[PDB]
Design a protein around this ligand. Structure first.
Ligand code: ADP
Ligand code: ADP
Ligand code: ADP
Lengths: 20, 370, 370, 370
């Protein structure tokens, strides 16, 4: 979208893997 | 009188403005008043003698800049009145203060005197029909669409972490520091002088912010980066003179994690996030760990969220699912939630009207916010 | 080897020390281990790098103060070992640990692991011939000269009520909260940030304790003080800067009676005192109401006993004579009783000898205390 | 190899040298390299064509003077190498560089590249066995005999206030400004052109320094002196022609307190002294105000110490004991402390040896200075 500052390819979140 | 209300997202670094029910703020400009250093001999000069917004960004070199807000606490009240007047004026909004209700923002655990004097400005000097003051964390969660969430924010003035769970903000679990983007930029400036390149003026200070925004990253292991020798990357000024930054680019944002570098023992960003989850009740901790939301400008460093994960893995209990979420629109997250909050029909009940302010005073404003 | 035994009244805030059969503890100093915040460049600086006692009180600004003991539960054992080593050293007592038997104090209902590790320190690291751990409430009654009475005390860590009747301590009628002087000082600090004046640093925390000690008073009716507007009395810091404290000075010590303000649903001092009298047997309640002994540091607030009476009048059965006794030397009441208990000829039978500890271990210490 | 070590007090205006354990530096000469403007036709002339020390002071008019060091930062490294070689040569010291260890001095918060290049010169061009770089503030306190106190200094290069409490220099409270004696002398010259008596040549520049040293004074109230009309007192030049100085004498050293006159928004001496004290922790501030040490040549203006106190009374908190102490030999303060520091037995542990430099490099020098 429009406006000066964005970050491209950080991702929405960083998550640990879910174990059983 | 229920017109389309205005959303003034305050902050020491940047001030966002616009109307309710919009996707993104149309009016974003940095929060400072610029006044000229030099004498105007020649006629046909830049009139007014007070510069706010894009004029001040364009003509930095002339203007002795000074920030009215430090750590979400307005020091110079005359300067903020001029900025809020500039926001309302024809150069930005093109509307009167009398028509629209106002949505103001503040950091949590601020001085109550500043909140009272803020209300005084909007009700007396400007003639506002209704004012409402809100938190950053509650607005960030409105923008995402969640209810559960720990909001680790990092603006220019303040860093804090309010743990909300299913629409229940816990006021005593709030952890706050006065270490943030401005102090990192001030710490980078001090390093650049130790490297060689000196900057001292207030117009010259914003170059250091631009270097900090562009060329800075957080090392995953700082001891490993210390032992190794850096590459020394370059940067071009508006002048054109090249600057070898060196190790100061990675050591600058370490102020956020190690606040002992500036010489002021605080918790740190990662410790504030853990302490906020720990101060809350036992059964709420695992849900608060799963919903960690990021916001503000000082979360935009390269490898910030990766390091913030690793610090939580070090501190928090083992075998727990950590999820540090962070939307695409982190800078305008607080404004978007305010625009969403303003558009809802419940907004009419929450605000403080002018009639209610004239009758009661400051006590009614303190009651309605909490 | 029956030398003059040493009484060490432990506590989170302050640590009193001295010999048995004395009128007042000669050696009182605050229980914390300060270590320097800055880098010593020049030679002839303060040597050692670990500061306990009056040197720490003199050079607060240099040292990052941290307490080893919270709520009568030692967290950092290495710091408490250094404090006890400082007590015995030539700067204070001028004696060896090998000569004198030790009288130790601990809060009731503490972790047994801490009591075992306390004994390990005194028997093995120091080479004490005989140790004896005792309760604070029993010693306070020894100092007054009574046998009967409930003992409400309020140190820096713990607030507890022990109902005792003619030398019969009732362990099941004991009440306890982890809400005391330190939490009141922490709650005052948070309130001063809401006023305006922040004291984030660890050395700067000691200024908040000094404000709490001097400029605080407990109002009788809290709702009446909330409706009325305060005068905002002044206070001078160690630097010289003036501070209007405002309504925080009276609302801060209210934590003791209302622990829902900090966000920790507990009983409160006045409820604990009534609960301890109620949980005891029916025939003892009226004698326990008449004999109520105050002790510790957080009983020294202005209008504390007046409010405590009013709260007992509210809760207790009607037409019952209440009497909240308060000695002159309330802070040293726990030590004075220890010095009295140490001076008695029965003391030789109560203690745990070194030979007895080497044979049995922790089980003998658990048996002899109760 | 532990010979009687050499002290080289480095400075932009003046450079002072000698040996350890001496009362006063025997070898004080100005830090510049004069080179002849005119052509040498006749034989039996001044040989060498590179003049340093008393020959350069004697023959000013011949030589195009240029200072290698500006603001404690050498620009022309070849000239400083020639000055250091002249110090060691038979014209001044009469010693070899290989025998004695070196005590060099530098201002705080300088470029680290200059510090490495300084070390390279002493270790490789000269063959020094051991080198040590130190701060001017720490040495001034060694000279006086104290450990506590702020060291305000003002030479020809830099003005900086370093707060040190009981041998603990606080690196994050070190204030610095590039507004010292050279900028005052440059500002005096510009004023004398406004008066009428212009100066342009480099040999002719040192006459302005002589005018600055002799006929100048700092008034208490600058607005009162501005309203009043000056007497226009005289001064005779080295030629013989008289100069009526006028208001240029008193307004010239005002630059140190008002840096807006030259056109550079900085703190000023009086603000730097207060800011350095304010940046430190609360408990150390009152002791830092009681111990203020002056140093350098630009503290020798008439009514400077009286103006400093008036400015401290204005800025600092009320009812605080201010005391601006100073040595008798304010110019030789930093050297005497270095000579004291050099003669101590600990000095062997502090320095960077030649073997240690050859192994590690610049990192070992950055590990030993700070
Ligand atoms: N891409 C970026 N990388 C690093 N820092 C940034 C970036 N963008 C902005 N900042 C910093 O964050 C600040 C703006 O954050 P913001 O959340 O608007 O603060 P506030 O809302 O308190 O004004 C700026 O002052 C800047 O120093
Ligand atoms: N006059 C006073 N009024 C209120 N609180 C006080 C006063 N004097 C001391 N205190 C608080 O109480 C504590 C001292 O109580 P003390 O009985 O020594 O506790 P402990 O025995 O657990 O160390 C101090 O740490 C201080 O915070
Ligand atoms: N009596 C005086 N009055 C005013 N200024 C002086 C006086 N004596 C010396 N100065 C100035 O101060 C400088 C000497 O200070 P010093 O600390 O030795 O400088 P450096 O930075 O070279 O060590 C000289 O260069 C001169 O310009």
């Amino acid at each position: 979208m429009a406006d000066p500052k964005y970050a491209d390819l950080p991702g929405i979140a960083r998550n640990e893997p879910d174990v059983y | 009188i229920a017109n389309q209300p205005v959303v003034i997202d305050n902050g020491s670094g940047v001030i966002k403005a616009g109307f309710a029910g919009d996707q993104i703020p149309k009016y974003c400009f940095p929060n400072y008043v610029g006044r000229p250093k030099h004498v105007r001999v020649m006629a046909g000069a830049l009139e007014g003698d007070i510069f706010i917004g894009p004029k001040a960004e364009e003509h930095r070199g002339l203007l002795s800049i000074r920030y009215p807000m430090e750590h979400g606490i307005v020091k110079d009240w005359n300067d903020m009145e001029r900025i809020w007047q500039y926001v309302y004026s024809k150069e930005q909004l093109q509307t009167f203060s009398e028509e629209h209700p106002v949505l103001l923002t503040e950091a949590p655990l601020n001085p109550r005197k500043n909140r009272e004097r803020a209300a005084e400005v909007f009700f007396e000097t400007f003639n506002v029909p209704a004012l409402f003051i809100s938190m950053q964390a509650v607005l960030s969660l409105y923008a995402t669409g969640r209810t559960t969430g720990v909001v680790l924010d990092s603006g220019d003035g303040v860093t804090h972490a309010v743990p909300i769970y299913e629409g229940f903000a816990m006021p005593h679990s709030i952890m706050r520091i006065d270490i943030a983007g401005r102090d990192v930029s001030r710490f980078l400036r001090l390093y650049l002088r130790k490297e060689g390149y000196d900057f001292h003026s207030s117009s010259e200070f914003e170059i250091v912010k631009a270097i900090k925004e562009r060329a800075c990253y957080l090392s995953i292991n700082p001891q490993k980066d210390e032992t190794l020798e850096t590459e020394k990357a370059q940067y071009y000024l508006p002048d054109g003179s090249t600057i070898e930054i060196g190790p100061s680019r990675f050591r600058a944002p370490e102020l956020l994690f190690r606040p002992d570098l500036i010489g002021e023992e605080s918790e740190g960003i990662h410790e504030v996030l853990v302490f906020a989850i720990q101060k809350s009740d036992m059964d709420l901790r695992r849900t608060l760990f799963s919903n960690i939301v990021l916001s503000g400008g000082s979360t935009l460093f390269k490898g910030f969220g990766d390091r913030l994960l690793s610090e939580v893995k070090k501190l928090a209990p083992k075998d727990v699912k950590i999820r540090i979420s962070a939307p695409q629109e982190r800078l305008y997250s607080t404004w978007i939630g305010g625009s969403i909050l303003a558009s809802l029909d419940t907004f009419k009940k929450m605000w403080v009207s002018k009639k209610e302010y004239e009758e009661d005073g400051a006590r009614s404003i303190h009651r309605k916010t909490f």
